[PDB]
Amino acid sequence: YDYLIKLLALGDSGVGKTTFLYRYTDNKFNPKFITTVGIDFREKRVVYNAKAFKVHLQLWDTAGQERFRSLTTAFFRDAMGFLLMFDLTSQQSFLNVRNWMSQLQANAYCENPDIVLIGNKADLPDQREVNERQARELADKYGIPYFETSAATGQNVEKAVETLLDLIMKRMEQCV
Amino acid sequence: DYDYLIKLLALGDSGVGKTTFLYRYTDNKFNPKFITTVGIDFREKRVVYNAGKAFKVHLQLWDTAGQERFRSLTTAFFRDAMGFLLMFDLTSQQSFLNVRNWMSQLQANAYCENPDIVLIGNKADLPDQREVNERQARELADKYGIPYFETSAATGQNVEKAVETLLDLIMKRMEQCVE
Ligand SMILES: Nc1nc2c(ncn2[C@@H]2O[C@H](COP(=O)(O)OP(=O)(O)O)[C@@H](O)[C@H]2O)c(=O)[nH]1
Ligand SMILES: Nc1nc2c(ncn2[C@@H]2O[C@H](COP(=O)(O)OP(=O)(O)O)[C@@H](O)[C@H]2O)c(=O)[nH]1
Ligand SMILES: [Mg+2]
Ligand SMILES: [Mg+2]
Numbered sequence: 001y002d003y004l005i006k007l008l009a010l011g012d013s014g015v016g017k018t019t020f021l022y023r024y025t026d027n028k029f030n031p032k033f034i035t036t037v038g039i040d041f042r043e044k045r046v047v048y049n050a051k052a053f054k055v056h057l058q059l060w061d062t063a064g065q066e067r068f069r070s071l072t073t074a075f076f077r078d079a080m081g082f083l084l085m086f087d088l089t090s091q092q093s094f095l096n097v098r099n100w101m102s103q104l105q106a107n108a109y110c111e112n113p114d115i116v117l118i119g120n121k122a123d124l125p126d127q128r129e130v131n132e133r134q135a136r137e138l139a140d141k142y143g144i145p146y147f148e149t150s151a152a153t154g155q156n157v158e159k160a161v162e163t164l165l166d167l168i169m170k171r172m173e174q175c176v
Numbered sequence: 177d178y179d180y181l182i183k184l185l186a187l188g189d190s191g192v193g194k195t196t197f198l199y200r201y202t203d204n205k206f207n208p209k210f211i212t213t214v215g216i217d218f219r220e221k222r223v224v225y226n227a228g229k230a231f232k233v234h235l236q237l238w239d240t241a242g243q244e245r246f247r248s249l250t251t252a253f254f255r256d257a258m259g260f261l262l263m264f265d266l267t268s269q270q271s272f273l274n275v276r277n278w279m280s281q282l283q284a285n286a287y288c289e290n291p292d293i294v295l296i297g298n299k300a301d302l303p304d305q306r307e308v309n310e311r312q313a314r315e316l317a318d319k320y321g322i323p324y325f326e327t328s329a330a331t332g333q334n335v336e337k338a339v340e341t342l343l344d345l346i347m348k349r350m351e352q353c354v355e
Contacts, residue, residue, distance in 0.1 A: 001222075001234040009237060013244040021237050025219040034215030037246060039253045042202045045178070048347055056178040057343065059186065059198050059261075060253060066190040068214060068246075075216045075238055083237070162223070165233065169225055 005168055006078050007161070011085030012093045016120040019151040020085065024161055035071060037064040081114045081164045088119040088148060089127040098138055110175035114167035115144050118160055123150035182346060183256055184339070187278075188263035189271045193298035196329040197263065201339055212249055214242035259292045259342045264313075266297040266326060267305040276316050288353040292345040293322050294338055301328035 009017040044057045084101070087093035097117070106112075117139050119130060132148065139146035145163050149156040186194035221235040262279075264271040275295070284290055295317050297308060310326075317324035323341050327334040 002231040004234045004236060007235065007237045009239045013247075018239055018241075021219050021239055025221050025237065027219060027221075030217055030219050032215050032217040032241070034213055034241070036211050036213050037249070038209055038211035039249055040207055040209040042198055042204070042207050044202045044204070046343070048343060050347065050351065053347070054177065054179045055343065055347075056181045057184060057339075058181060059184045059202065060257075061186050061195055061198055062253065063195075063209070063211070069190075071214065071216055075240065079238075161221075161235070161237075165223065165225055165235070169227065169231070169233075173227065 003169075003172070005080055005165065007081040007083060007164065008075065008079050009083045009085060011118075011120075012087070012096050015085045015087045015090070015093050016151050017083075017085055020083070020118075020120065020149070020157065023151045023154060024157050033071065033074070035064060035067045037062075037068050039063065079113055080168045081116070083160070083164065084115050084117045084144075085120055086118070086130070088121045088130050089124050091129050094119070094130050094135070101138070101142065110171065112171075114164055114171060115142070116160055116164040116167070117144050117146045119146065119148045120151060122148040122155055123152040180350075182258055182343065184259045184261060184342065185253065185257050186261045186263060187275075188296075188298075189265070189268070189274050192263050192265040192268070192271050193329040194261075194263055197261070197296075197298060197327070197335060200329050200332055201335050210249060210252070212242060212245045214240070214246050216240050257291055258346050259294070261296060261338065261342060262293050262322075263296045263298050264308065266299045266308050267302055269307045272297075272308045272313065279316065279320060288349070290349075292342060292349060293320070294342045294345075295322050295324045296338055297324070297326040298329050300326040300333055301331045 009021055011017050039060060039062055041058050041060045044059070046055050046057055047053065048055045084097060086097045117135070119135055135146055147156040147160040149160055151157065186198055188194050216238060218236045218238045223233045223235050225231045225233045262275060264275045295313065297313055314324055325334040325338045327338055329335060
């Protein structure tokens, strides 16, 4: 290969991220890195004098936090592009993305991962509840291409990914 | 056979001393666990890209897993919490700046639902590695009107004291909020 290009799928649960990548790729097996996180409690019986109360302390703790940090770090490591995903049938999924993309830190021209905004499930027109001219707006406001895609159909899937490949490669040329 | 069930949480970066602290304090081995797996993964697609000149691009697309189950485990963690044992490691300035940042983005509830907090500088038993200045921590404590204990989980110093204090604030908030 010439270049190895890392991309991330980003978006809320249920938005179709995993179905998206299956559609585009389609490749029997793929590697997973996985770990156990959790919570637990303990108890202690104690007496508190206000008067003289019988109190049950149940104390909680997290487990696996560092192991999960590493995973998130490995995920973001060296990412060149974001497949930025909301649900074309969920106005909440679209609002969350907007909120997220406004608490985004600016970067120098070259460190700045390219972003392509994606409205998924365009093959469920009946359940649609997201204004497509309102989507265009968020795209335009950040100079970001937008696409309406179907992980079902295949509609725009290849084209979205490739459009982001373009951005990355142009940018790479500009920073060599 | 009890009057009140009072839920507390140990918060803080990893390695700070939380799990130890708790065991030090309860001195019993009852400890149910709710554990879930999360992960990440990638896929591959070979693509030809031309600017003109032709480049063989190896595409690798990553994805996460278990986000939603992780969310709701964290929601379960915070649900009906009444007091945070807010902890940092006196030997790790970074552990303390994380606590302070965290404090700065708590959203205060209504008085009666607002969780009580105690700030804890754990690992007081290792003075030769102390990196978090005393006055700095006390100022955080006060910025929030919070008590502050330097504790050793290894040693039991102030562990008893800290929890008791936290409980006492919780109980006070209750007598005021009754009826
Ligand atoms: N009809 C249709 N259903 C979809 C599409 N993408 C995802 N889904 C469904 O929506 C649900 C959530 O999908 P998923 O890929 O797991 O979203 P994720 O949390 O972002 O990984 C699943 O039941 C999918 O079958 C699509 O493009 N068309
Ligand atoms: N010297 C010292 N070491 C401690 C203390 N508390 C915890 N440790 C050690 O720090 C390491 C991480 O502690 P741990 O309880 O797992 O912290 P956690 O990640 O918050 O659960 C362990 O090897 C503990 O023995 C303390 O008060 N003093
Ligand atoms: Mg998924
Ligand atoms: Mg622990």
